[PDB]
């Protein structure tokens, strides 16, 4: 049976987490994203000027082209990418997927062109939302799941320290106590779950649903919840230069918790201080608006507090406080 551990590393301020992945012999630094299902990489088919500052895949060297197949994706922050497709060998933490679909980028939006921290994305959402046409392809996880000791992956994202992606096994030394599991609704291809209630410092409210997303930097909630939270932060104000609510870096922030199938997941106020707003001398809050989409995005700010198991059996998500 196979299992493996891939180490992730946060970029400045934990904006994103990157992990090495070997494709046809070349290692690339990718952003593992539980919110999408495409494995796409910077390639030699992009303009030379866009290949600069990146490790790129050269499909002609080892890939098998899928003639006439294309991909096109648009993300929540407005970024997008598109290209063609090849199959190749993909290795993550010693687990190798043979004939894994690799989406070679032919076009990338400015957000990707400016980000030299990653060389593409490895999607870990359900394969049902893979964008390849005419026939969608499976994610790296779906491709190898039948070969793992257990059909699950687990993650520990940390604040300014290396973390891990465990494939096919659970490392009990990464959390305190026992895991609590909750059912996942994968109807929209996400690892979506329900929370029965929330507590924002001194205020508590009714439940809602959200997705566990390693590919989103913040914890994005409904505007009502954001308001409630910041009403308790002295001097918090919105700053469009920073991207949302900001406050004095020294401010004592209230904690945020959600009740999940009887387990209380708490994000300590210290983790809600994302870092320098980069707009003078305030800090950006880890909690921001979900722009009215109707569901919450449990991004990295939230994940930094837990060890989370993404189990394809159910499917379900297990949670426990990080050790």
């Amino acid at each position: 049976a196979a299992s493996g551990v891939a180490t992730n590393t946060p970029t400045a301020n934990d904006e994103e987490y990157i992990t090495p992945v070997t494709i046809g012999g070349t290692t690339l630094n990718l952003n593992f994203d539980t919110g999408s299902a495409d494995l796409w990489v910077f390639s030699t088919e992009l303009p030379a000027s866009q290949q600069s500052g990146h490790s790129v895949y050269n499909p002609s060297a080892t890939g098998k082209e899928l003639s006439g197949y294309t991909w096109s994706i648009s993300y929540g922050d407005g970024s997008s990418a598109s290209g063609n497709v090849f199959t190749d060998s993909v290795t993550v933490g010693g687990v190798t997927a043979h004939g894994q679909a690799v989406q070679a980028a032919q076009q990338i939006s400015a957000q990707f062109q400016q980000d030299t921290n990653n060389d593409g994305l490895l999607g870990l959402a359900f394969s049902s939302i893979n964008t390849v046409q005419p026939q969608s392809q499976t994610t790296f996880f779906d491709t190898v799941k039948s070969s793992l000791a257990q059909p699950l992956f687990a993650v520990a994202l940390k604040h300014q320290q290396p973390g891990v992606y465990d494939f096919g096994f659970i490392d009990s030394s990464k959390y305190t106590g026992s895991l609590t599991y909750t059912g996942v609704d994968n109807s929209q291809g996400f690892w979506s779950f329900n929370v029965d209630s929330y507590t924002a410092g001194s205020q508590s409210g009714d439940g809602f649903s959200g997705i566990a997303d390693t590919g989103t930097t913040l914890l994005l909630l409904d505007d009502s919840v954001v308001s409630q939270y910041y009403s308790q932060v002295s001097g918090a104000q919105q700053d469009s230069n920073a991207g949302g609510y900001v406050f004095d870096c020294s401010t004592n922030l209230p904690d945020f918790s959600v009740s999940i199938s009887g387990y209380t997941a708490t994000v300590p106020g210290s983790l809600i201080n994302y870092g320098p707003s980069g707009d003078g001398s305030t800090c950006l809050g880890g909690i921001q608006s979900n722009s009215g989409i109707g569901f919450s995005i449990f991004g990295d700010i939230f994940l930094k507090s837990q060890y989370v198991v993404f189990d394809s059996d159910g499917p379900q998500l297990g949670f426990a406080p990080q050790a």
Binding site: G76, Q111, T217, L218
Partner: peptide
């Protein structure tokens, strides 16, 4: 930050 980003929002995948």
């Amino acid at each position: 930050x980003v929002v995948x």
